Each structure stands twice: as structure tokens, then as C-alpha cells.
Design a protein around this nucleic acid. Structure first.
Ligand SMILES: [Mg+2]
Ligand SMILES: [Mg+2]
Ligand SMILES: [Mg+2]
Ligand SMILES: [Mg+2]
Ligand SMILES: [Mg+2]
Ligand SMILES: [Mg+2]
Length: 81
RNA sequence: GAGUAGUUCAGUGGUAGAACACCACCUUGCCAAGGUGGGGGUCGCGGGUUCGAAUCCCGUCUCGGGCGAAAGCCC
RNA sequence: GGGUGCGAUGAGAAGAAGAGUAUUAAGGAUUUACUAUGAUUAGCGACUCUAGGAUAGUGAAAGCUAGAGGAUAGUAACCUUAAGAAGGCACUUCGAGCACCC
């Protein structure tokens, strides 16, 4: 769902920043890219589900980057609405 | 002429030097830098000369080049 | 503006380390190791001693190997005092630029 990502009010970018966004429950929707290494994805989606927050996985992470406006690509993006 | 420490170069008859690299400690999450120490070389290989050969001689191996009809020879 | 490289699998900055460590002095201790050097005189060549080596010549004493032990300095290693730094990854906040080139 890049409609939700390329828009939205507040969005944090990067697995660490999404984990820090989860660590204070200020995030409303969590987006995670599929073709990323699951070793890192696991830790953020687990904490996400544990918090009880919705997770919307997306196909491409380069596309995630492009939707965020970033030029390098992201693994996880948190929408801190 | 080219072949010498792991690499790169010195060493022009006295058992192989420097630099860098490597190991150990300093030392620690981890490396770099650094400071002490340390280990390492059929000197292409084999005979001879000599008390002693990386050095001289002979045979021989590989590479680059020169001479020669070639064998050889020279660098 | 152009050509690359890296970058949310974290650019970059600060912090935290590194650390009271390196380094700089004054003493202290005077045992360790390392380095340099060893009168005259022959000899290319000498810190001394033992054991093998090998040994032509020179010398009171030879070059190798293995030990052990020495003076003269120069160093590091250990205490006390006063000062006292430094790069990167990783870590911790901020989170997107940084680097080489013309
Ligand atoms: Mg011819
Ligand atoms: Mg021929
Ligand atoms: Mg950084
Ligand atoms: Mg820093
Ligand atoms: Mg401290
Ligand atoms: Mg120009």
C-alpha cells in the first residue's frame, strides 16, 4: 500500500527508527518491505504485533524508498500518525 | 643482464641487511595507529675452487636481449 | 553544472568509549630484557667462558651452532608527584547526505 506511504502526515524511515517509534506507541500504522532480510524484519513486526498495531507488507523496498522520497531504499517504515 | 626474508629492494669472497608485512604483550567490544620485544633466507638447483661462495668456476633450469651457419657464446 | 563511489541493512554530527592510556617532566627502584660498542698489534674479521663443530694464514684469544655469563653507555618494563591527548566500526540521541574528480 504505497498510497498510504507516499502520503500520510508523519512517517519515520528505517528499521531502527520504526523500532523506536514502536517503543513509545506513537505510531499508528507499520509498513514493512518483503524482499528485506527477515532477521531484521522479525524484530520489528514482532514488537509491532505485540503492541497490537496493524502491519501492511509491501512488495518492493526500492519502491518504499521512492515513496518516502529517499534515494537509497528502506527495510521498514513506520507511519507515526 | 633477470632468479636474495611473506612483498619490495640492498648487499661488488667473511654464514643475510633495511623497510614493510607477520606473531606476542602493552590490550580493552573490535580494528587502525603507536611502543617494546621475536621469527624468517637449498641466495633458481647441483658439483668444484677456497679455511670460507649470494659473490669465483663448471654443469644445469626459467625469463628478456645480443652474436653465430651451427655447436656454442655473450649480455 | 558534469563524471563516479557509498548511503535508512543508517549519510553526517555530537556523545560515549579509547583513558587518566600514549606522550612530557622531576625523583624513586638499580633487578630484568633489547640495542650499540670492546684498547695496543699482526688479521678481511675479536665482550669473555664451556661444549661440539672446521681450522689455510694471522694472533694472547677467531667467523658457525647451542648455552651461560660480562663491563660502558642508550633504551624500554615497575612505583611516587604534577599535568595529560588521538582515528574508524560497533554502541547512544538527532536522521540524509558524505567522499574523489574537472
Ligand atoms: Mg642467425
Ligand atoms: Mg641456443
Ligand atoms: Mg554514522
Ligand atoms: Mg563519532
Ligand atoms: Mg572513565
Ligand atoms: Mg575542466
Amino acid at each position: 500500500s504505497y498510497d498510504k506511504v507516499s502520503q500520510a502526515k508523519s512517517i519515520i524511515i528505517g528499521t531502527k527508527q520504526t523500532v523506536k517509534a514502536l517503543k513509545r506507541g506513537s505510531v499508528k500504522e507499520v509498513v514493512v518491505a518483503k524482499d528485506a532480510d527477515p532477521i531484521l524484519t522479525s524484530s520489528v513486526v514482532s514488537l509491532a504485533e505485540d503492541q497490537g498495531i496493524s502491519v501492511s507488507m509491501v512488495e518492493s523496498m526500492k519502491k518504499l524508498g521512492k515513496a518516502c522520497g529517499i534515494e537509497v531504499g528502506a527495510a521498514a517504515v513506520a507511519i507515526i500518525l
